[PDB]
Amino acid sequence: PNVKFYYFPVKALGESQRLLLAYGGQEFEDNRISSENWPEFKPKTPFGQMPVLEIDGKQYAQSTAICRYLGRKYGLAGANDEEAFEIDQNVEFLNDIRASAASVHYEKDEAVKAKKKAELEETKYPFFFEKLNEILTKNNGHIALGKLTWGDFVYAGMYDYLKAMLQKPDLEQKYPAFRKPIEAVLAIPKVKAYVDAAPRTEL
Amino acid sequence: PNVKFYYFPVKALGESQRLLLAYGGQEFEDNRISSENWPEFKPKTPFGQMPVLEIDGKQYAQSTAICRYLGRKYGLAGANDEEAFEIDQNVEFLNDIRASAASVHYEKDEAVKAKKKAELEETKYPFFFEKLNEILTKNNGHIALGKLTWGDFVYAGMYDYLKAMLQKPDLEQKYPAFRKPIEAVLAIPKVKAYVDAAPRTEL
Ligand SMILES: N[C@@H](CCC(=O)N[C@@H](CS(=O)(=O)O)C(=O)NCC(=O)O)C(=O)O
Numbered sequence: 418p419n420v421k422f423y424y425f426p427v428k429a430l431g432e433s434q435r436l437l438l439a440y441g442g443q444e445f446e447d448n449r450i451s452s453e454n455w456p457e458f459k460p461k462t463p464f465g466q467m468p469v470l471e472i473d474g475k476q477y478a479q480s481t482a483i484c485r486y487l488g489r490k491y492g493l494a495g496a497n498d499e500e501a502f503e504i505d506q507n508v509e510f511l512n513d514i515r516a517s518a519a520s521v522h523y524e525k526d527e528a529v530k531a532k533k534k535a536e537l538e539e540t541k542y543p544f545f546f547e548k549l550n551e552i553l554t555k556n557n558g559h560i561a562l563g564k565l566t567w568g569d570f571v572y573a574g575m576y577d578y579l580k581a582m583l584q585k586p587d588l589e590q591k592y593p594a595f596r597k598p599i600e601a602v603l604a605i606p607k608v609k610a611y612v613d614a615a616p617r618t619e620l
Numbered sequence: 621p622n623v624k625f626y627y628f629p630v631k632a633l634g635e636s637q638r639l640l641l642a643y644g645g646q647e648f649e650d651n652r653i654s655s656e657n658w659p660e661f662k663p664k665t666p667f668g669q670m671p672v673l674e675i676d677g678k679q680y681a682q683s684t685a686i687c688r689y690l691g692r693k694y695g696l697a698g699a700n701d702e703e704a705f706e707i708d709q710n711v712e713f714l715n716d717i718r719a720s721a722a723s724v725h726y727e728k729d730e731a732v733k734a735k736k737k738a739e740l741e742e743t744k745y746p747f748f749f750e751k752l753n754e755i756l757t758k759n760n761g762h763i764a765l766g767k768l769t770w771g772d773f774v775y776a777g778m779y780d781y782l783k784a785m786l787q788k789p790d791l792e793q794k795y796p797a798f799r800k801p802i803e804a805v806l807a808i809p810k811v812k813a814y815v816d817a818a819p820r821t822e823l
């Protein structure tokens with residue numbers, strides 16, 4: 418198929434799709450649209466956002482939905498409904514962590530941001546980190562099924578962005594399991610080759 | 621199967637699962653756990669939250685993941701990968717609306733809440749409402765595929781909760797399409813029977 422991927426020049430929510438395309442051996446145009454050029458493309462997208470994946474002229478939007486689609490195409494979505502459910506479930510948990518951290522990161526009033534951060538540090542984050550540690554340990558370094566799944570790609574693509582929003586650059590010092598899905602994805606030669614060749618960003 | 625559903629005594633994020641079980645003709649224990657009793661059950665759940673669906677003793681958490689699972693079991697997830705993708709995509713869009721509204725609704729500082737609300741009213745909500753109107757019109761009163769899907773159940777279950785968070789009780793006056801997925805779900809006799817028999821709540 419003729420495949421084009423459109424996202425900002427950052428990893429954040431789109432990198433997981435890039436990593437999955439690499440995994441599946443799919444050649445693609447990796448179109449990294451700057452903030453300055455984005456307004457020209459915005460009204461051409463399904464929801465006025467990126468990422469957008471284009472396959473043979475047809476557009477696919479919504480990062481998690483795209484990852485699940487690619488996951489199924491590439492054999493990373495389990496063998497049956499129950500296995501597929503578990504990946505969905507655990508990725509939805511990751512999304513709760515991300516949404517919580519984003520509520521702090523994108524707060525423009527610094528006094529409000531400080532209050533929110535402190536609240537999450539006492540009432541959500543300790544629970545999230547222990548739960549993530551449980552999941553990664555139960556699954557032998559993976560997000561789900563004890564083995565490589567599309568959930569690991571979601572995790573690996575957003576991990577640096579999530580750490581930035583949490584303001585815990587050193588998270589994996591206390592929780593060494595947290596680097597394991599990233600190592601799993603990078604151990605795949607096609608994926609490592611794409612990462613080596615790809616533009617670097619902090620988030 | 622022996623099926624039990626655990627959630628708070630509210631519609632909010634859990635009602636879509638109740639509606640789907642009704643659709644599929646699945647008898648279930650609808651266990652509405654109060655805030656007062658919830659701390660006893662919390663550590664028995666997969667992530668310290670509800671909803672939780674139990675099937676033959678096995679627990680399933682994460683509302684959207686559960687809905688998609690039930691959707692597939694009951695023939696409401698499309699006929700192929702492309703159709704399934706579209707439902708996922710459009711439900712992920714609904715989630716963006718919900719997450720945005722929740723950022724206002726759950727703000728405890730009223731001065732901050734007012735600023736956030738005003739910002740969303742000028743910069744996100746007009747776009748969300750036009751996009752939702754497009755989708756519902758394109759799909760003949762549905763969230764996806766031009767026909768009944770599990771996405772309609774997600775929409776119908778949370779609609780009153782979403783309107784409460786948006787502070788637009790009268791939303792469907794400007795946008796009459798917005799009531800159509802709810803009408804579609806309620807036109808199914810098994811679903812209407814469950815709704816008639818079920819406890820009522822404002823959200
Ligand atoms: N639910 C969507 C959210 C996408 C989204 O928020 N995209 C952003 C930026 S990023 O946060 O993902 O980097 C966007 O297009 N922003 C630009 C705009 O809204 O004009 C998804 O998961 O794909």
Ligand SMILES: N[C@@H](CCC(=O)N[C@@H](CS(=O)(=O)O)C(=O)NCC(=O)O)C(=O)O
Nearest residue numbers: 513628632633668669670671682683684
């Ligand atoms: N991502 C989860 C979120 C669930 C969630 O936030 N549940 C809440 C309340 S509700 O907002 O959905 O009504 C909960 O259990 N809160 C209780 C607690 O955290 O102790 C899902 O979609 O199921």
